[PDB]
């Protein structure tokens, strides 16, 4: 067969014509694809035009001629222009291929933005759908019931509210130990991967934050975080939190790790601050 | 619905059928819907498929008449796959052979040959032996004196159109400018000055004035009954050969020494 | 190895399958550059020995 | 610390600065690279051999792709013996992160005729490898 | 008796497995492993004729079978029903080994790494129903199961290089179907066949490997030529992603042959040579292979004919293959002489063979090289000829024949003359010289530039071995 | 099967690989910078033959 009759059945006035022959070539749209791709003006004639009705096949059959030749580029921005077609692309499982290279699409743009502004995910900087399609790869990734492919995938794009709302409904204080090596896979994490200055900054506070939400918790992981960023306020909280949950064991536990483990700098400007909180001069 | 179009073709207006069927392409896409679109044809699906061929045979041939290539473009298209499916199911019919010839006529009028050998080597096998060459011996000889340089032989052939006469005329005089033209482009380089009388006999015609009309339109001035070269000919080839995309890659001599140059010593 | 026999809730199974090379697929446009680097690095530096 | 350097040519004098101000920068990494290439673009020797020293404590504690292609470029390009060997023991500050990488590239900056650039390959081992022992760092020290 | 041909066979077997296995278990070798496969296979069919057709089924019976048991006992039961222990699963001799199968984890199928071992198993297969010409139903059956097989899979580099081989026979056994005896069978599982190579092609481009797409391209090229659709086949070649970077001799090979066609039926002349040329060279010249050397031989002579160059005399003369190129050398001939008469004659009684062969094709247009070398001839000879005397030598019909034959020549170029009508000769303006033209700048760029492309190739491929030998251990 | 949490050992190696990438990445460095000890050791070839 050959798929150039229905191509010329696009031609014909009536809109009936057209959309009975655009679907014939969707049977045969990666497995019949050279004479698309020759007169394929004519199908984005069929997208330009608004009185069309069926735009959103006319966006999907070019989005494949373009995934097909290897130009990865187009078929992602088409990908995007149908309106939907989206439903299509899960009941596919040979091309969510097009799926990934929007996360790729999406993580250059995110990278470069971060630089200039703190959030650009809430400006329209970024285009909304691309965003979609982003956060629903993160989902299906959790539909396989995997945390680990789901913060990967979200780190990248410079996501710090999908971080936190990930790591929050898998806590639920099952146990004090079980919520700590969690966080201990993160800040282990940005140390290693995250070079950039600002965004590890960011989600070694978050860190922070939840085992100090806690009531409880390794306090030995959070000396980590305090160390790293070299700073006193951290600390200074900690300590606070201490004071009022004292005993003799355990400040005398973390103090020693914390006096080895800390820098000169560090160490001299906080003696200072713990005077002003009124904690003993025994820490000191 | 159906029979609207058969009886307006017997008539013989081909108007009336060519804005008359659009209505029944609605039609075809129901009786698509009940044949398999060509993974099996039985006898169950012969008497379906008989009505979607029927109704393409005949919208082509009205449409050559009324000079809609557009028109034509869609039905030789679509007849393609249909006569292409099986060894014989339907795959036989004496318009086979005419639209064939039909098909092939419109490549060569466009003057592009490319188009005429790739359908050559697809109607070789099964379609060219079974209808066999009986209106096809016409579009391959003529193509044929078109490759030799011999002119003669085609512009003979026209005129043997006569006998077969139907709508192979709206092709025949597309056919006749373009091999006059042909012509021109050869006695351009072959000679550069004539006599009034030769050039008439030549490119094909009765009366002299004809010949300085056709003279005033390639842009080529007779002046005391003399055709000239000498000018023309590189004036025409100049402007066109005027482009700036290949104009600036030449590739120069300074240019191929050091090509030649880093060559050596990396 | 991965089986599609068998598929369960409506192609969970393998729409997993088929996102799991397309992940691996942006590492191994990286890795066809270390596979040509080995070629290369060793080439040089028996170049730079014979120096 | 720059200017003091410039005007004096008392020879002892002159190191000690250029050494101090690569001490004063560390930690900063990215923003240290303004003094990096001021250093590096000097004529003076001492000049020189301090800023092979601003890219190893500035860029200390984290591994960079960076640090390395612009210290490999200083051992080459200056023939001048003690800038040569300063820019090999910058590599292990820098690399003291993940010090199983150390052996692999400094395996061939000690098949090198220049016995400076040798010299310094020793150090570099030192400084990754100090704190837990590591068998391939014996085979190059051999 | 049959007992014992099974044994024998099945120990001949494992050791062949074992080479095999240790690799893909040591990670990918890439070159290595297809290097070892093709050796093996050709030892391995013709092996399966003696001591026995059940060969192959020995080596399923002990390992472990995902879907491998179901399609040997398909293949049995056809080639009359046999037990004598050949019911896969029957006899036992894998005794806990992780190489041959382990007996405990199978159960479990805490095992799966037949997938690659099936892929080979089948190829033995593909080939020995092959040798045999008892393609037919066991083909057809091999084609429907191992289809979804592949999509089961989501596949490793190793498994692509096996995967790429029984490509070649599934292409193969439609066109042998097809090829015995149209069939309306035949016409339905062809557009099958282009659509599902089609569909194969886009997924193995994405695990980046070089056989399996090198070889596709290759399939559907040739699928292509059988059908007549050469714009399919250019926007096929338009497409743009043929590698060079790891692909076999044989795929290249096999390339540049359907190029040369392809070129050629479009009316492009000048680029089929290069590839005509480049066809053979890549092609061994064995007696296995001999047929192939025909085929471009044949196709040698239409294409250097067409762009205006005279074929060597001696290139024909001087093979064995002397007597397959007799029609041809007669086509050579005659347009060197530039008898019309002569070529006419030729291609009339050897018509059948010519069709065969589909050269006949490209004849029906070495008519019109025919003619300008008659006047060709003429030309040279003589500067000043009446027009007259050109007509009565090459038996031409009028005064306005002659005119236009000539006419066109002259836009071409070839023969390059002037005529003149009112002087009542021809009178050839040929110059004649080339060494005070810029043209010899032109041919010395060519020279050069391949010249300095072999000493890159030198210099890059002479230092892969010297290293290897410095990793092993020597003084 | 019956076999889980091949998931989580999978999904192991979806994070060491990011960095294990970036380790052999100054491997590619050693390339690119024997050009340049070669090109420069023409000329200390030039110093030694002084």
Known sequence: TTAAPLLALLRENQDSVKTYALESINNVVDQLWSEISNELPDIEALYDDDTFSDREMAALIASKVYYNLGEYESAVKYALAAKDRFDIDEKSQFVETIVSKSIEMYVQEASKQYTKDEQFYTKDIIDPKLTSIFERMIEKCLKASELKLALGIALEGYRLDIIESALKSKLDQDSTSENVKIINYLLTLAITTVTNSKFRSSILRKSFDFLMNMPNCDYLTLNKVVVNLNDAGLALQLFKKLKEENDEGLSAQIAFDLVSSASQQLLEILVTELTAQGYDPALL | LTKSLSIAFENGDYAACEKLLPPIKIELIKNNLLIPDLSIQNDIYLNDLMITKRILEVGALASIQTFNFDSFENYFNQLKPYYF???????????????????????????????????????????????????????????????????????????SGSQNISEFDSFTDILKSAIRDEIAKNTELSYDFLPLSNIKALLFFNNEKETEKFALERNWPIVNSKVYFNNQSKEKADYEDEMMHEEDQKTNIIEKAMDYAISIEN | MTAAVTSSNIVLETHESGIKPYFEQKIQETELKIRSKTENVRRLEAQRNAL | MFTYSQETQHGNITRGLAVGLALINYGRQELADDLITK?????????????????????????????????????????????????????????????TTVPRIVQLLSKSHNAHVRCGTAFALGIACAGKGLQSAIDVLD | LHHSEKKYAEEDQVQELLKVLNEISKTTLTLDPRYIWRSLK??????????????????????????????????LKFITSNHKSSVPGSAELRNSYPASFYSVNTEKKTIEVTAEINCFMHLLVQLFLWDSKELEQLVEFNRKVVIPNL???????????????????????????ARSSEEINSDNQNIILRSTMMKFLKIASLKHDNETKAMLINLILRDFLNNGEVDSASDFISKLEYPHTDVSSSLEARYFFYLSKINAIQLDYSTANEYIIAAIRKAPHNSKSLGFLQQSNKLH????????????????????????????????????????????????????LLLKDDTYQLCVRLRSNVIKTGIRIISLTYKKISLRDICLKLNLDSEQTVEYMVSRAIRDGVIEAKINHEDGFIETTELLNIYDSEDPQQVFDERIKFANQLHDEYLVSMRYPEDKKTQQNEK | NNNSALSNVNSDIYFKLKKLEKEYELLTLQEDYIKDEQRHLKRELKRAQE
């Open chain 5, 151 to 177: 999509l089961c899979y989501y596949n490793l580099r190793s498994l692509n290089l096996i995967n790429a081989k029984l490509w070649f026979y599934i292409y193969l056994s439609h066109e042998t179907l």
């Open chain 5, 301 to 352: 002579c239409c294409i250097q004919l067409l762009m205006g160059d005279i074929p060597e005399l001696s290139f024909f003369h001087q093979s064995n293959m002397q007597k397959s190129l007799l029609p041809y050398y007669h086509l050579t001939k005659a347009v060197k002489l530039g008898d019309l008469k002569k070529f006419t004659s030729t291609i009339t009684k050897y018509k059948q």
């Open chain 4, 39 to 99: 250093m590096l673009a000097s004529d003076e020797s001492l000049l020189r051999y301090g800023g092979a020293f601003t890219i190893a404590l500035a860029y200390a504690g984290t591994g960079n792709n960076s640090a390395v292609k612009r210290l490999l470029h200083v051992a080459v390009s200056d023939s001048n013996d003690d800038v040569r060997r300063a820019a090999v023991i910058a590599l292990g500050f820098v690399l003291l992160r993940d010090y």
């Open chain 2, 85 to 159: 499916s099986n060894n014989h199911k339907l795959s036989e019919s004496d318009k086979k052979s005419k639209l064939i010839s039909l098909y092939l006529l419109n490549l060569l009028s466009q003057n592009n040959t490319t188009k005429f050998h790739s359908e050559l080597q697809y109607l070789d096998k099964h379609i060219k032996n079974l209808e066999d060459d009986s209106l096809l011996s016409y579009p391959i000889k003529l193509d044929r004196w078109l490759m030799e340089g011999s002119y003669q032989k085609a512009w003979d052939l026209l005129q």
């Open chain 5, 42 to 75: 050709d030892l391995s069919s013709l092996r399966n004729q003696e001591l026995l057709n059940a060969e192959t089924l020995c080596f399923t019976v002990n390992v472990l079978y995902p879907d491998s048991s179901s399609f040997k006992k398909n293949l």
